[PDB]
């Protein structure tokens, strides 16, 4: 295909131009809701922890794809391994509320607690980057999914439910120095 490149209009040429035949494609695995819908680790934890998806690892499957969007929306599931009872409070609650039973509190049941939580931010969508300040770099404090507290929080997994992503941003593979290809050990049978 020949065109005006400067206009930046999408152009998708096919193998038919030189006699080939375009095949059928099945893209379920790159569907946004599907791909974000799996548990990933949060990692930097404390007994009092504010749920912030930006604490996912930046190169992890979910963390990288999330950072490759400017705005997003989703509900959430969490799996928490903790000592003591686990309390959760919604976005906007005073940190002091984490000490009370009247807020959703899960009594310990081995091996860990799994819960479904709704989006509770006061904004219509959240952002992974925010160009400005929120007080009268970092993200506004209101970008969170609430907070949890237990005597000890050993592990925390989060899962984005019914995710929506808006305005794509750069997503990078590892840099290559080999001058030809990034090579690594791909799994193969023994002996």
């Amino acid at each position: 295909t020949t065109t005006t490149g400067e206009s930046a209009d999408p152009v998708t040429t096919t193998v038919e131009n030189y006699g080939g035949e375009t095949q059928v494609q099945r893209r379920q695995h790159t569907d946004v809701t599907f791909i974000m819908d799996r548990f990933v680790k949060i990692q930097n934890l404390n007994p009092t922890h504010v749920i912030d998806l930006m604490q996912t690892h930046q190169h992890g499957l979910v963390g990288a794809l999330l950072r490759a969007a400017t705005y997003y929306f989703s509900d959430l599931e969490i799996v928490v391994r903790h000592d003591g009872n686990l309390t959760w409070v919604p976005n906007g609650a005073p940190e002091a509320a984490l000490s009370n039973t009247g807020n959703p509190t899960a009594y310990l049941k081995a091996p860990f607690t799994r819960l479904a939580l709704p989006y509770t931010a006061p904004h219509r969508v959240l952002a992974t980057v925010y160009n400005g300040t929120s007080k009268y770099a970092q993200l506004p404090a209101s970008f969170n999914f609430g907070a949890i507290q237990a005597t000890t929080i050993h592990e925390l997994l989060v899962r984005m439910k019914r995710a929506e992503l808006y305005c794509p941003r750069p997503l990078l593979a590892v840099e290559v120095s080999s001058q030809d290809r990034h090579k690594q050990k791909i799994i193969a049978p023994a002996k």
Partner: protein, 207 residues
């Protein structure tokens, strides 16, 4: 009807001592246009014709189990061979005729078989080579075996310089016997034609 004429391109083979044609695994080919060649494959009928190879000399001293094999494709100095060097991927089936000309006073029996994914068979496994597409050649009855097989393999197109899906196997079932009026040995030849030849991925010239 013991007389059969087979035609592949501008080549023919006529035999008056045949016991028919055995089709192995199928009587037709899988689809030759799948997703892996993106519609860029083409057929080359000029390659679909007979080429020849001597397999071995069947002599009275070769005992049961003596096995001779020919992996396909083999070195080909004609059109088919040039395709192997000019295209990255190919697929084709085989039309195979094996002849063992002695006379009717010889006795004994050869098993002629086409084997997918050859591996050296142990002596005990040789008792079961009839699980593969085959025919027998027995001097009292026929001088020719004829087997037709389709292309097969984990991949829809192949790189024959790296993998050979089919192997022609000839095994002595009962040793060649001789008389005063029989032949003393029988030279075994193969007359082979590639079928439904398709190529994809034209390569650069070497110079």
């Amino acid at each position: 009807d013991r007389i059969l004429t087979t035609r592949n391109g501008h080549t023919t083979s006529t035999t008056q001592s045949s016991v028919g044609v055995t089709y192995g695994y199928s009587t037709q080919e899988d689809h030759v246009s799948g997703p892996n060649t993106s519609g860029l494959e083409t057929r080359v009928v000029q390659a679909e014709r007979f080429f020849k190879k001597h397999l071995f000399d069947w002599t009275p001293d070769k005992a049961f189990g003596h096995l001779e094999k020919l992996e396909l494709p083999t070195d080909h100095k004609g059109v088919y061979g040039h395709l192997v060097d000019s295209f990255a991927y190919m697929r084709n089936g085989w039309d195979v005729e094996v002849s063992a000309v002695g006379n009717q006073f010889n006795g004994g029996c050869l098993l002629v078989a086409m084997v997918p994914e050859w591996k050296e068979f142990t002596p005990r496994e040789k008792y079961q080579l009839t699980l593969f597409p085959h025919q027998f050649i027995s001097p009292r009855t026929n001088m020719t075996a004829h087997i037709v097989v389709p292309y097969l393999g984990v991949n829809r197109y192949d790189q024959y310089k790296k993998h050979k899906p089919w192997t022609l196997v000839v095994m002595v079932v009962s040793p060649l016997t001789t008389n005063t009026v029989s032949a003393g040995q029988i030279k075994v030849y193969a007359n082979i034609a590639p079928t439904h030849v398709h190529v994809a991925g034209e390569l650069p010239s070497k110079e």
